[PDB]
Amino acid sequence: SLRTLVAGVDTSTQSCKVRVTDAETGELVRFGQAKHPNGTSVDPSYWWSAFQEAAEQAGGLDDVSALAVGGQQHGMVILDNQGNVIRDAMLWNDTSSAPQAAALIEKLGAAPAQDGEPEDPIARGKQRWVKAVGSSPVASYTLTKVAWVAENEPENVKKIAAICLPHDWLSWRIAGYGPVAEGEDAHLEALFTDRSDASGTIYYDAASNEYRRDLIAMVLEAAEGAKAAQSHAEAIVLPTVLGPRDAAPVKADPAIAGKNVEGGCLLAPGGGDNAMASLGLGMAVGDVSISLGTSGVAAAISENPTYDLTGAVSGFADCTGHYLPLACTINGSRILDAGRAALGVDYDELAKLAFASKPGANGITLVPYFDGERTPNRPNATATFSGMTLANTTRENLARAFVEGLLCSQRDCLELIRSLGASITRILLIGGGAKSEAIRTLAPSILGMDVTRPATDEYVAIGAARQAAWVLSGETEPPAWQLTIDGVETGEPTEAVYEAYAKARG
Ligand SMILES: [Mg+2]
Predict the structure, then answer these.
(1) Is 10 a catalytic residue?
(2) What is the distance between the alpha carbons of residues 63 and 6, in angstroms, rounded to a whole number?
């Protein structure tokens, strides 16, 4: 206890991780982890139980001075007057609320075009959402879940006394709050959040630090009538949005953390997983990370708010008081799976093939919108091979086109983010795709820069610990922790590859 410890909690869809860490160095001291049930909806009771089991495995938190929770984004947790969870949390990957996301767009776009606005009501609705709160509705977003509940479960929507996100709710439970008996104080107002998670609700505007309670009323109207919906949306407790390095007004309950340290365990604001990982990776303004799993996520840190009027790039906030333009791609590594099926080869086979080719694949371009794309915003799109010729239509060139297509899409994302006014001056490559020799080899060439490969690690848990250490220290800058790098990929830029891709995708 002479040594100052913090704890970074990572409550993700799949599990809870607890990383007890050295406040000064970021060094791992203890670790623990527990599983969540599968499903795109879930009883938060399982998140509490997983946290408890994870923390116990990590040797408890009695010696911990500050704690932060990084959480899966968007998940809707609704509480009644008594602090009870009303119905299952609906998560980022629930698609139940898809109709509501569509309807929200039509509803905001309905009013006639104003000076400069698109004539198409859909394009116009998308643009109005982006300007209002940073992002155009998709099923992931919290507001769409609340909408769905109003439409499908009116008795439940009318009981809502508070709405919060997974990291918010876990933090509140850690502070020792929870369900109370009738006529007891639930302390719902003790709820707090940060800018990064709140920016994922589409009822919060980070630029102005304002909850848009009118957008909540808008979805409650279906169950309650207009004025009643207005009254409800005003009455609902929403978490206090804390600054990036503010301690919460409440500390951890001593039975949970800090009983053996001076001042107990303070609570840092916490945050959404993408932004927390970025903090953990030590990312600052100008950095982008590409997380390449079967699908992709390109997230850059932006000094100023970012507005993709198209509704492809999300306008989230990061965990340093700044901005997190976030570009999801449906097609990441899965493109390479397509390649294997198409050519009847395995991974190495595909790579050997592709390297046998040349940059540009002798003219063949793949626009890999298998099953559409999130970025650019083209839901009903399909993938397209172009530039084919008798001479060039071969397994080698096709192989190379599959790889170049994967990378070109990610570049396309970087260019779109740049177009929103956010400079990108360094690239980090993480996720499973990062171990792919072909992706790893061709990335610098087609992305157009060095590609840094941070060592695989618990970036969310590390980011949460870094934020708790930041708050605990009271200093203006976050803890300068050592970052481990696996390697840096360098390669001469080949602009013609992406230039051909851009033509093809249109
Ligand atoms: Mg509060």
Answers:
(1) no
(2) 9
